[PDB]
Amino acid sequence: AISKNLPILKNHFRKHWQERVKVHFDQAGKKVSRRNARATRAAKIAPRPLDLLRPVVRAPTVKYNRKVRAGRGFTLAEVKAAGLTAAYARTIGIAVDHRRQNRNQEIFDANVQRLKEYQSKIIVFPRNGKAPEAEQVLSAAATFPIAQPATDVEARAVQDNGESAFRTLRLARSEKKFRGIREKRAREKAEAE
């Protein structure tokens, strides 16, 4: 069972796995079906673009916070600031997420400008008459792509003020480590008489 020098393997095939083996022969036919469904939905919503406008939004999780990303909806404050309601926006092609909140003016302003560009880029046909032909597109996310904000410039001058920037991190670590002990020593000093 154990034999010559080979790594310890962990193969989880002690159950009845060969009752549950899903080989995706479906892949190509299913891609075809996806494409045809997209085309069908398009034909049903013939002027409309098959996808809503989603916002630009900053990612969680410090691994990814450096990156911006597409989100769910435009944060009722943002649509009010852009000058229309959520119940009307949802009918115009704008996704609204009541449960996210604005904590940053950069993202707020970015999504607001996104909404303005959208409102200028679209035309909304009246409920009455003409149906003024408009040669539909299929991606709002392609028209309004998600743009990574530029953080700085390519070249700058050097501002070296001599505190060495590893000492900095080290002292931050130290004061976070000994915060509570120091507050306790201060309390006990104040306790003196």
Binding site: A1, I8, V62, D152, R156, V158, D160, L169
Partner: protein, 148 residues
């Protein structure tokens, strides 16, 4: 495939390369890593030492994202710059136009000092750095500015 297999060559030969005495049987020593403290102990102690026991302290709900700190050594540090401008910034060994290098946006978390950048000034935007790395950068004439 089947026809470059030695099974085709074992045809006619009785035991199929498995022995007349030893007789390929089902599981003549166990199944799996059985016998590790027992009849397979020598294999385990010779080739997989440390397999038995426990060594330290647990971590419940460990996410491999608080530990994201991909490292970059100084020896590279210009691979982050496109080649269209590298020679320019190197021959213009100049302050007041020194290039800024955002390692985080490139996907790095810490800078390390393996070896020998040139003597050009550079601004390095990093989350963390090492002592020797910063020493070498500002010896080349640049600076590190911390970010998050």
């Amino acid at each position: 495939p089947s026809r470059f297999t030695k099974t085709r060559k074992h045809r006619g030969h009785v035991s199929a390369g498995k022995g007349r005495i030893g007789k390929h049987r089902k599981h003549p020593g166990g199944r799996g890593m059985a016998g590790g403290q027992h009849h397979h102990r020598i294999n385990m102690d010779k080739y997989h030492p440390g397999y038995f026991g426990k060594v330290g302290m647990r971590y419940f709900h460990k996410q491999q994202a608080h530990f994201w700190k991909p490292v970059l050594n100084l020896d590279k540090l210009w691979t982050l710059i496109p080649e269209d401008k590298r020679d320019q910034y190197l021959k213009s060994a100049s302050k007041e136009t020194a290039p800024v290098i955002d390692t985080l946006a490139a996907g790095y978390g810490k800078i390390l000092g393996k070896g020998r950048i040139p003597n050009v000034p550079v601004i390095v935007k990093a989350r963390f750095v090492s002592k020797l790395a910063e020493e070498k950068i500002r010896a080349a004439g640049g600076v590190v500015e911390l970010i998050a």
